[PDB]
Amino acid sequence: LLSILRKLKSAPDQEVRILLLGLDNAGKTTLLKQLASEDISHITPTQGFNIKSVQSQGFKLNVWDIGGQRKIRPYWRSYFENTDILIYVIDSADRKRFEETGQELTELLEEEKLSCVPVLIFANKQDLLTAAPASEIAEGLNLHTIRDRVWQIQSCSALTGEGVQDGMNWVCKNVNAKKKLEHHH
Amino acid sequence: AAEEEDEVEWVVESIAGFLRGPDWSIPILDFVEQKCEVFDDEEESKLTYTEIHQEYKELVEKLLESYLKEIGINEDQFQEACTSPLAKTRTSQAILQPVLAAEDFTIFKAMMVQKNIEMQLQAIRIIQERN
Ligand SMILES: Nc1nc2c(ncn2[C@@H]2O[C@H](COP(=O)(O)OP(=O)(O)NP(=O)(O)O)[C@@H](O)[C@H]2O)c(=O)[nH]1
Ligand SMILES: [Mg+2]
């Protein structure tokens, strides 16, 4: 059986699978590359997905950055299984798409294959003078109503890097949150 | 317990033998050759890679299941063998590669990208020679 095979890994307990989701243009690939200390200046729309592994605070974070275009979103569920942490990225300055992203987030958090998964919401592009505050986005999403999981909202700018690590610090304290909750269940 | 761990050691060596042999290795190689064509040596992955990884997972589960059943090794024994440090030291990185590739997509992708590089090169050498 396939799940037994993880026992043949070098250090399988140090490995964290992170799913990075959000609308097209939200700044996901830009965030991913910042995390991996890579150049962010030649980034184009993602037609499939990227993976980058980042060593941080005693863990190997395997980060799956899936393309956000609408035509790609039906494939999102191909990536739900064996997710340890969900990071959801919002363009804080694209108010016209708040409803669209609110609806994607709501659907993700009702998804059976993401049950018990901790969610970090990155309120991105805070460098922009047009950016709504995280407090506003939290309210607008009704994040306080989130049940059956831990969650966090973090103001950030993938472009400048500001606020990014603070979000990742929360992620690292919650590497076992999903399996601790599903053991409770 | 000591005798019980010797039996685990047998199970580890049996698994190692299987992973070295043609019953495992040849269906894996056929799959890799037949499906590697769309794997480009590029950072960004295509959505189809995932669909193909899923078939790979199915093949691996099928091969392992047949093995475990023809030989008569139950799942619990299989798990305690894969959990034993003997599993790492009695197998090699090369033998483990297509096994790890079942759970580790990054390993699967590098394996397919490498086979496509090789087969494209061979296709190029042939074109080179026919003139
Ligand atoms: N000002 C500003 N621009 C940003 C920030 N993060 C990303 N961007 C810009 O927003 C655009 C989209 O970025 P990108 O990372 O490609 O978004 P994406 O979520 O990966 N898109 P897709 O899902 O289609 O692949 C790029 O021009 C990028 O430079 C940020 O924090 N501030
Ligand atoms: Mg992208």
Author numbering:
A (entry chain A): 3 to 187
B (entry chain C): 2 to 132
What text comes from the article?
The ciliary protein Arl3 has been shown to act as a specific release factor for myristoylated and farnesylated ciliary cargo molecules by binding to the effectors Unc119 and PDE6δ. Here we describe a newly identified Arl3 binding partner, CCDC104/CFAP36. Biochemical and structural analyses reveal that the protein contains a BART-like domain and is called BARTL1. It recognizes an LLxILxxL motif at the N-terminal amphipathic helix of Arl3, which is crucial for the interaction with the BART-like domain but also for the ciliary localization of Arl3 itself.
Here, we demonstrate by X-ray structure determination that BARTL1 binds Arl3∙GppNHp in a similar fashion to BART complexing Arl2∙GTP (Zhang et al., 2009). The asymmetric unit contained two Arl3∙GppNHp and two BARTL1133 molecules. BARTL1133 displays the same all-helical fold as seen in BART (Zhang et al., 2009). As expected for an effector of small G proteins, BARTL1 is in contact with the switch regions of Arl3 (area 2). In addition, BARTL1 completely buries the N-terminal helix of Arl3 (area 1). This unconventional binding mode sets it apart from effectors such as PDE6δ or Unc119 and from many other effectors of the Ras superfamily proteins. The hydrophobic side of the N-terminal amphipathic helix of Arl3 is buried in a hydrophobic groove formed by helices α3, α4, α4′, and α5 of BARTL1. Leu3A, Leu4A, Ile6A, Leu7A, and Leu10A are submerged in a hydrophobic patch made up by Lys58B, Val61B, Leu65B, and Leu69B on α3, Phe79B and Cys83B on α4, Ala88B on α4′, and Leu97B, Val100B, and Leu101B on α5 (BARTL1 [B] and Arl3 [A]; Figures 4A area 1, and 4B). The second interface area is formed by switch I, switch II, and residues of the interswitch toggle of Arl3, and on the BARTL1133 side by the loop connecting α2 and α3 as well as parts of the α3 and α6 helices (area 2). There are polar interactions between Thr51B and Tyr81A, switch I main-chain nitrogens of Gln49A and Gly50A with Glu45B and Glu44B of the α2-α3 loop with Lys45A of β2 in the interswitch toggle and Lys35A in the α1 helix.
